[PDB]
């Protein structure tokens, strides 16, 4: 049963701080509180412990990540061009 | 094919003898009533011979070349088998299932294992079996 129309997790803030600010903070709270799939063990147990720190409850691996998501698109693209540059250098 | 046969060298991974090297005297793949799982009767080294340098006396070398053996019924899950083999004629049927049911039979079997292992160590062969694992 859906209890709110649009505020979602931002409903804890009530009428304070402004609608646009609550909507802006909602994305970060949803991504920072979601559970993620571990790239090491495959279980859905990776959660944030501090800002930029993501640990898996099952295999106990701790990974340096984004502030509110596990990976940032800049770092994913950086990994891609790093692989490209390494292939160019080796070849 | 099967590799857990007689003369197979394994590493014990659990229990009091964890990290020790053993040789399989007898494989019991189908298990028994006492041990209803794939297991093995093995003989191994509890205390390894010490390192021998070129300036030691004969008495000190003889003191440091002593081997303390042990015998064990061990689960297959608590063994890490290796590609090395150790074939000793003196260890043929040195232990069996009811050896472990009587303390004096264990002592006589350990005496035989100690004698055979010390002969093989003094031969200079199979140095990997008599050096301890570092972990």
């Amino acid at each position: 049963s859906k209890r709110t129309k649009k505020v979602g997790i931002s409903g804890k803030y009530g009428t304070r701080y402004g609608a646009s600010l609550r909507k802006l903070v909602k994305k970060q709270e949803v991504t920072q509180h979601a559970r993620y799939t571990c790239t090491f063990c495959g279980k859905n147990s990776v959660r944030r412990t501090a800002v930029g720190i993501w640990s898996c409850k099952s295999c106990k691996k701790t990974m340096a990540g984004g502030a509110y998501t596990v990976s940032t698109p800049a770092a994913a693209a950086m990994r891609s061009t790093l692989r490209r540059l390494r292939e160019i250098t080796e070849a | 094919m099967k590799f857990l046969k007689t003369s197979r060298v394994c590493l014990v991974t659990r229990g009091r003898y964890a990290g020790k090297k053993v040789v399989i005297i007898q494989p019991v793949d189908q298990g028994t009533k006492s041990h209803p799982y794939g297991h093995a009767l093995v003989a191994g080294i509890e205390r390894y011979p010490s390192k021998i340098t070129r300036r030691m006396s004969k008495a000190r070398i003889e003191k440091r070349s002593k081997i303390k053996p042990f015998i064990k019924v061990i689960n297959y899950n608590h063994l890490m088998p290796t590609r090395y083999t150790l074939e000793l004629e003196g260890l043929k049927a040195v232990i069996n299932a009811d050896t472990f049911k009587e303390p004096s039979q264990r002592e006589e079997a350990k005496k035989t294992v100690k004698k055979v292992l010390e002969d093989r160590y003094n031969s200079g062969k199979n140095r990997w079996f008599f050096t301890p694992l570092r972990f």
Binding site: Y13, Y17, L21, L24, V25, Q28, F40, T49, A50, V51, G52, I53, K60, K61, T62, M63, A64, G65, G66, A67, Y68, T69, S71, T72, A74, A75, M78, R79, T81, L82, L85, R86, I88, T89 | -
Partner: protein, 191 residues
């Protein structure tokens, strides 16, 4: 805070080959927006091993082997002199001079881009996070990748308490009173 976030001192192993370390912990440093990584290396001169504290790049994890030296590979978390990387590589904690253990590109989500190399004079042109162009000695080191914790400033603080919690461990002056709200003896803007 326990230790500063610095590279290893530039020694013979980093100057001529590579030395391997293991990442043991990724920890939160109060007052800093980026996580730190505790890495253990061997001492080449004694039996005891040495624990270092690096700024953690994104994608680094516990139990990972990283490599510091001239002959280290081009992988995230490795520490290389700028002459050992190609153009277009982004790096973190870039030394201004070879041996000061890191000066440039240290905060969360930031990096320094290797624009080019001048091998005759042993110089490297780099682009800083502010957009500035700098020339450094080519023996200056850097850690491959982007500093972890990026996107921190996107979330609104939303609360005076959250600002207070941010600046209490940072020692920065908070709250800020406007100079125009003061008397003429307190501020030049006073009155």
């Amino acid at each position: 805070r326990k230790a500063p976030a610095k590279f290893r001192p530039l020694d013979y192993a980093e100057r001529h080959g590579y030395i391997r370390g293991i990442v043991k912990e990724i920890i939160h440093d109060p007052g800093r927006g980026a996580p730190l990584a505790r890495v253990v290396f061997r001492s080449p001169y004694k039996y005891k091993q040495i624990t270092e504290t690096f700024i953690a790049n994104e994608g680094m994890y516990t139990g990972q082997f990283i490599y510091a030296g001239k002959n280290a590979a081009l992988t995230v978390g490795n520490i290389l002199p700028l002459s050992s990387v190609p153009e277009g590589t982004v790096v973190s904690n870039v030394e201004e001079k070879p041996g000061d253990r890191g000066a440039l590109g240290r905060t969360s989500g930031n990096y320094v881009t290797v624009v080019g190399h001048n091998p005759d004079e042993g110089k490297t042109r780099i682009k800083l996070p502010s957009g500035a162009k700098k020339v450094v000695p080519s023996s200056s080191r850097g850690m491959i990748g982007i500093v972890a914790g990026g996107g921190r400033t996107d979330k609104p603080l939303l609360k005076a308490s959250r600002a207070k919690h941010k600046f209490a461990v940072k020692r920065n002056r908070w709250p800020k009173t406007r100079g125009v709200a003061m008397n003429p003896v307190d501020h030049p803007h006073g009155g």
